[PDB]
């Protein structure tokens, strides 16, 4: 137990700290015009989310993919229709016009 033995302060009531309070408690006992208004005239006088709609569109990516070219085709469909689903901005319109027909 080193730091206990080192402890410059050890084994004491605050006899020295009460004398500090006594010295300072004695010291306790011993002891705009328009601009304020100019500013305060104005009121103060106190003083998931949209990515779910993507997640639906990416679920709609599953639809066109599930229609044409899932697994059987290596390149001819599942890669070609892969290029034509989810990646391009046009896939917004492909769903949007299906929504517009659904309306």
């Amino acid at each position: 137990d080193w730091d206990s033995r080192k402890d410059r302060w050890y084994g004491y009531s605050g006899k020295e700290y009460n004398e500090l309070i006594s010295k300072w408690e004695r010291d306790k006992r011993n002891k705009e015009i328009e601009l304020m208004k100019l500013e305060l005239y104005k009121d103060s006088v106190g003083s998931t989310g949209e990515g779910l709609k993507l997640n639906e569109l990416n679920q709609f990516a599953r639809s066109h993919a599930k229609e044409m070219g899932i697994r059987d085709e290596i390149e001819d469909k599942e890669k070609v229709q892969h290029v034509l689903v989810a990646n391009p901005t046009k896939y917004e319109y492909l769903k949007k016009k299906r929504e517009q027909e659904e309306t």
């Binding site: 601009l35 208004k37 500013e39 005239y41 104005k42 009121d43 103060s44």
Partner: protein, 137 residues
């Protein structure tokens, strides 16, 4: 005493052209200050209408953040380097087709810094609201 400070000020508050000349920045001072100071008051009033549409909680402290500027501007305590950057933001904020130029000017204003941050940040909310305000209108 205080009554004539109400009378003279509120009369002066309704007596201004809400315009910033982009060439008068080169000139030397209270004219650009009070132009901006009372242009901000219009940005305050346009807020005051659609406080139900917009989120009002942050504005209640935005007011307290703006209070320094008011005290700076009507006195000309605000520095030239700050003021030139500041007025540059407010001028671009007037034209609806300077929204790039608005936040552009705000970023170059921001880039001691304890309440200065607070109020300068509060100005960004004024652009943020105004940019939205002109959109949803």
């Amino acid at each position: 005493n205080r009554p004539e400070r109400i009378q003279e000020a509120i009369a002066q508050d309704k007596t201004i052209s809400v315009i910033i000349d982009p060439s008068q920045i080169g000139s030397t001072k209270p004219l650009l200050s009070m132009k901006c100071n009372l242009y901000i008051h219009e940005i305050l009033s346009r807020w005051k209408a659609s406080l139900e549409a917009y989120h009002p909680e942050l504005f209640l402290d935005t007011k307290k953040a703006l209070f320094p500027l008011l005290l700076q501007l009507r006195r000309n305590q605000l520095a030239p380097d700050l003021l030139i950057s500041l007025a540059t933001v407010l001028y671009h904020l007037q034209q609806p087709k300077e929204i790039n130029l608005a936040v552009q000017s705000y970023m170059k204003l921001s880039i001691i810094d304890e309440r200065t941050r607070l109020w300068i940040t509060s100005i960004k909310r004024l652009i943020t609201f105004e940019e939205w305000y002109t959109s949803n209108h």
